[PDB]
Structure 1
Amino acid sequence: VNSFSGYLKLTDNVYIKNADIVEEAKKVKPTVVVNAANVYLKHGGGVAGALNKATNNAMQVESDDYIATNGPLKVGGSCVLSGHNLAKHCLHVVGPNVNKGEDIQLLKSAYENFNQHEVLLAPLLSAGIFGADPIHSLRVCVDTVRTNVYLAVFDKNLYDKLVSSFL
């Protein structure tokens, strides 16, 4: 049993809810929250910008030190950093950004990072300002992630379309 409430069950291991991920993290304090990161961990807007704002910029400060030591992530890659006030850990995952011309086949590699964690609160990778089709992102998630994933969808309209169209 876990703390997640109000989710629709899509499969054995994938759950979905219309919820503001910043507000969901604050309520649940999950072991892992996933950030929709870029390779520079520059959390300016989107999921990254919203989560970073909720940490009072502490996520960005920590991220800048990580990049100064390690250099940029790979598209499809990830790193584990602090969850600050939102979670124990934040898994920063880089899905491909279609608005930069990145290979959408890298979306499966991105979701494979989730399999290193037994339970996660996450957004749909490469959705929103990363430009991918969220219906596609949900299909790749279901077909790739084997651990227990609780997906948060900000847009009520999109949430209802993801559920109604789910095979």
Structure 2
Amino acid sequence: VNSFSGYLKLTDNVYIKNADIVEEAKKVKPTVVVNAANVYLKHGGGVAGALNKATNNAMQVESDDYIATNGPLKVGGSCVLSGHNLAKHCLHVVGPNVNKGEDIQLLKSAYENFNQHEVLLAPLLSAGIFGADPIHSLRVCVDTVRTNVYLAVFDKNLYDKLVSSFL
């Protein structure tokens, strides 16, 4: 039993809710919140920009030190950093950004990072400003993640379409 509330159950382990992931994380304080990161951990917009703003830019400061030490992530890769005031940990995961021409096949690799964590709060990877089809992203999530994932979908119109089209 965990403290996530109001989610629809898609599968044994995948759960979905119309919610602002920032407000969800502040309420639940999960062990792991997933960020829709880029390889540079530049958290300018989308989910990443919103999560960073909620940390008063502390996420960006930590991220800049990480990059200065380790260099950029791989597309499809991840790193674990602090969750600041939002969660114990933030798993920064880089899904392909279609608006940069990045291979959508790397989306499965991106979701595989979730399997290293027993429970996660997460957005749909490569959705929103990353330019992929969120219906496809949900399918890859369900077919790749085996651990317990609680998906927050900010857009109510998108949330309703994802449920009604889910096979």
Question: Displacement, 1:115?
Answer: 0.1
Q: Deviations over 1:62-85 (max 9, x none)?
A: 000000000000000000000000
Question: Displacement, 1:140?
Answer: 0.0
Q: Distance in 2 between matches of 1:104 and 1:98?
A: 7
Q: Distance in 2 between matches of 1:25 and 1:10?
A: 20
Question: Displacement, 1:54?
Answer: 0.1
Query: Secondary structure of 1:51's match?
Result: helix
Question: Displacement, 1:114?
Answer: 0.0
TM-score normalised by L of structure 2: 1.00
Question: Displacement, 1:22?
Answer: 0.2
Query: Secondary structure of 2:33's match?
Result: strand
Q: Distance in 1 between matches of 2:10 and 2:153?
A: 14
Question: Displacement, 1:86?
Answer: 0.1
Query: Secondary structure of 1:162's match?
Result: helix
Q: Distance in 1 between matches of 2:146 and 2:21?
A: 21
Q: Distance in 1 between matches of 2:20 and 2:48?
A: 13
Query: Secondary structure of 1:149's match?
Result: strand
TM-score normalised by L of structure 1: 1.00
Counterpart for residue 92 of structure 1: 92
* 1:119 is aligned to 2:119: yes
* 1:64 is aligned to 2:64: yes
Counterpart for residue 162 of structure 1: 162
Query: Secondary structure of 1:3's match?
Result: coil
Q: Deviations over 1:145-165 (max 9, x none)?
A: 000000000000000000000
Unaligned runs of 5+ in 2: none
Aligned pairs, number: 167
Counterpart for residue 151 of structure 2: 151
User: What is the aligned-residue RMSD (CA, Å)?
Assistant: 0.1
Question: Displacement, 1:51?
Answer: 0.1
Q: Distance in 2 between matches of 1:80 and 1:29?
A: 16
Question: Displacement, 1:121?
Answer: 0.0
Query: Secondary structure of 1:74's match?
Result: coil
Q: Percent identity?
A: 100
Question: Displacement, 1:48?
Answer: 0.3
Question: Displacement, 1:129?
Answer: 0.1
Question: Displacement, 1:6?
Answer: 0.1
